[PDB]
Design a protein around this ligand. Structure first.
Ligand code: FES
Ligand SMILES: [Mg+2]
Lengths: 86, 26, 100, 225, 113, 135
């Protein structure tokens, strides 16, 4: 969301995020089904499936996303350009 | 099966390649 | 017992016509806009011709005319394009009027 | 109780039949052939994702497999009939300027809606801000010409995909059926083909509405007695 | 946005005020015209503002209030006009009618600004 | 809430997941019909790409055995006087009639192709068909 006022930017981004929703399949409602390796615009993401109790040792941003999604355990390593959007 | 299916052939309506006025002449 | 699509296509008049170049066909006029005869034949697209200067008054809607088709569709690929630009129309020469 | 019984005997009943509205009799392979459905554009104008539907090329002109066209048309008509049965809003969208008058007349006769004019931005993704907060979006969109006047895919199909509106679209040999729910590979330029499509869809909608009234009237009569 | 019910209330208020105004001026309420209303308003409320629209005005609610179209969707939400999803149904229907009449004519075949 | 990501799965897949997650309180009107009669191909956005290298389109030309006869009759004896009437589904041109006679004589079992062509011309002359050669 973009706006001259920061509060307006918060409102616009939030109201557009609720319309644009993905669906994430959680294995046993705590992890991902299989390890995922991907590259997106010079950003390498490598996620490892973990057993229960492992925790979210992924990233400060990925922890926030995983908590919102509902994932409890994962290990993600980010390499290359650390860009929040990518 | 069916005999009306198209077969594999070279183009029979293809015209011969055009030749210059001096083709074949020393 | 039911006719197959391959059989229909094989025996269709358009297939047995062969190449469309310099072939005499019969078209029917269905639209006239300012001396522009939008003649229609048994093809995907129509052909637009000009009303003949000699006794052109008889060229009205529903009139059947004789045409010499040159191309069923005018498509051409130009510089920098990834596809052929098309005019969605055919090319033909208005020979005259079909008479029975 | 009564509402659940009403829904089960009226809405769920046709879903248990392969062809509840009997749309097979409407069209046949020979009828499509006489309507010049199989004709297509040049091989140079051929677009990807249409190759499976294209039967072949005949003198630099694509030919569409009418066997696949009949199956796709059967599914499209069945979906159209069920949506009309369910009191759904059907919108006919076509940017072609040769059949705009015919398509608008078809919408009037069948009782549904049409859009054959310039498609202003935001008619679907921003409909509430233009028509009104309580506007009801169409439940089905039928494309008779998926390409705009610059030989590119229409923006309505992308907007319908965004808004989760199923689309029944006629696709020629130079269209993109990737985002069309029910693509019908045929000819979108021959007047005979366009008239045939309008009549088939008009008949399917009219039969669905009439059968809905007959079933509802019969159910009310059975409930009374 | 003014609703039809609000317009009806304004019409009723206009009629009541018109009869009251005729009573104040001591004339026949039945044979009272808009010109008579304008004269009474001008005398009772003399305004010298050069712009006429800034002066007190008592006219019929139909003329005073703007014009708004009816809601195209009912309780079920179904639009009433086939060319509704074009956003300009009135214009496009008019263009449709003109084009149809032009086709019909083809089948058959100073002070005006 | 809904989902406006048209490039991520189909409309049905997105709707089904949202209903499963409880985001969509009520399923749409088309959901039941789609589930009952799904299309042959699920509509998923796929980007077209150019065919580089030696890749060729699988679309093949349409040819028949009679195409040799039609090409030969369009070269020698030229196009017929009768104008093609493509409106009539049962139209039979002079070239097609020549092809049919050539096929019939082939069914009889003549060996020489040149003699087969000449005999076909003789049959049309006997029938009265006008044969005006271009040369
Ligand atoms: S075409 Fe030029 S030498 Fe033959
Ligand atoms: Mg087309």
């Amino acid at each position: 969301g973009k706006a001259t006022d920061r509060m307006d930017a918060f409102r616009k981004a939030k109201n557009r995020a609720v319309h644009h929703l993905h669906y994430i399949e959680r294995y046993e409602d705590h992890t991902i089904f299989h390890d995922i390796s991907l590259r997106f615009k010079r950003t390498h993401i490598k996620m490892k499936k973990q057993p229960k109790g492992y925790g979210l040792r992924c990233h400060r941003a990925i922890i926030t996303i995983c908590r919102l999604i509902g994932i409890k355990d994962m290990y993600a390593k980010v390499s290359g350009s650390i860009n929040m959007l990518s | 099966s069916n005999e009306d299916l198209p077969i594999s052939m070279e183009n029979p309506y293809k015209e011969p390649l055009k030749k210059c006025i001096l083709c074949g002449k020393h | 017992n039911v006719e197959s699509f391959a059989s229909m296509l094989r025996h269709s008049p358009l297939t047995q016509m062969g190449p469309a170049k310099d072939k005499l066909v019969i078209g029917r006029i269905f639209h006239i806009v300012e001396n522009d005869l939008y003649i229609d034949f048994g093809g995907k697209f129509h052909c637009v011709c000009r009303r003949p200067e000699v006794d052109g008054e008889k060229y009205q809607k529903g009139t059947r005319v004789r045409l010499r088709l040159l191309d069923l569709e005018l498509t051409s690929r130009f510089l920098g394009a990834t596809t052929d630009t098309t005019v969605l129309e055919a090319n033909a020469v208005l020979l005259g009027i079909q008479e029975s | 109780e009564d509402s659940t019984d009403f829904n089960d005997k009226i809405l769920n009943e046709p879903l248990k039949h392969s062809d509840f509205f009997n749309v097979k009799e409407l069209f046949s392979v020979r009828s499509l052939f006489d309507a010049r459905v199989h004709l297509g554009h040049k091989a140079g104008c051929r677009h990807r994702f249409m190759e499976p539907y294209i039967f072949g090329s005949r003198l630099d002109h694509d030919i569409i497999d009418l066997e696949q066209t009949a199956t796709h048309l059967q599914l499209a008509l069945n979906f159209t009939a069920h949506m009309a049965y369910r009191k759904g809003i059907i919108l006919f969208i076509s940017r072609n300027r040769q059949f705009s008058y015919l398509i608008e007349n078809m919408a009037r006769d069948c009782g549904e809606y049409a859009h054959t004019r310039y498609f202003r931005g935001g008619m679907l993704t921003n409909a509430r801000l233009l028509f009104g907060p309580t506007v009801r979006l169409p439940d089905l969109i039928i494309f008779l010409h998926t390409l705009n006047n610059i030989f590119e895919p229409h923006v309505a199909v992308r907007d319908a995909a965004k808004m989760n509106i199923p689309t029944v679209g006629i696709v020629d040999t130079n269209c993109n059926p990737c985002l069309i729910t029910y693509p019908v590979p045929g000819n979108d330029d021959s007047p005979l083909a366009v008239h045939l499509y309008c009549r088939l869809f008009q008949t399917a909608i009219t039969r669905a509405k009439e059968k809905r009234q007959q079933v509802e009237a019969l159910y009310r009569l059975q409930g009374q007695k | 946005t003014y609703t039809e019910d609000f317009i009806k209330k304004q019409i009723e208020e206009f009629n009541i005020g018109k009869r009251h105004l005729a009573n104040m001026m001591g004339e026949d309420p039945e044979t009272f015209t808009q010109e008579d209303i304008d004269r009474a308003i001008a005398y009772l409320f003399p305004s010298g503002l050069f712009e006429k629209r800034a002066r007190p005005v008592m006219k019929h609610p139909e003329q005073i209030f703007p014009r708004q179209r009816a809601i195209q969707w009912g309780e079920d939400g179904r639009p009433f006009h086939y060319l509704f999803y074009t956003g300009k149904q009135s214009y496009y229907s008019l263009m449709h009618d003109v084009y149809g009449m032009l086709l019909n004519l083809e089948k058959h075949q100073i002070g005006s600004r | 809430a809904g989902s406006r990501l048209e490039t991520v799965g189909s409309i049905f897949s997105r709707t089904r997941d949202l209903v499963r997650a409880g985001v969509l309180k009520e399923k749409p009107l088309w959901f039941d019909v789609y589930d009952a009669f799904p299309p042959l191909r699920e509509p998923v956005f796929q980007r077209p790409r150019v065919r580089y290298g030696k890749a060729k389109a699988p679309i093949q030309d349409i040819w028949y055995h009679e195409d040799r006869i039609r090409a030969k009759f369009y070269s020698v004896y030229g196009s017929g006087q009768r104008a093609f009437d493509l409106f009539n589904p049962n139209f039979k041109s002079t070239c097609q009639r020549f092809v049919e006679k050539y096929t019939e004589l082939q069914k009889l079992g003549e060996t020489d192709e040149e003699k087969l062509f000449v005999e076909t011309g003789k049959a049309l002359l006997a029938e009265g068909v006008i044969l005006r050669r271009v040369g």
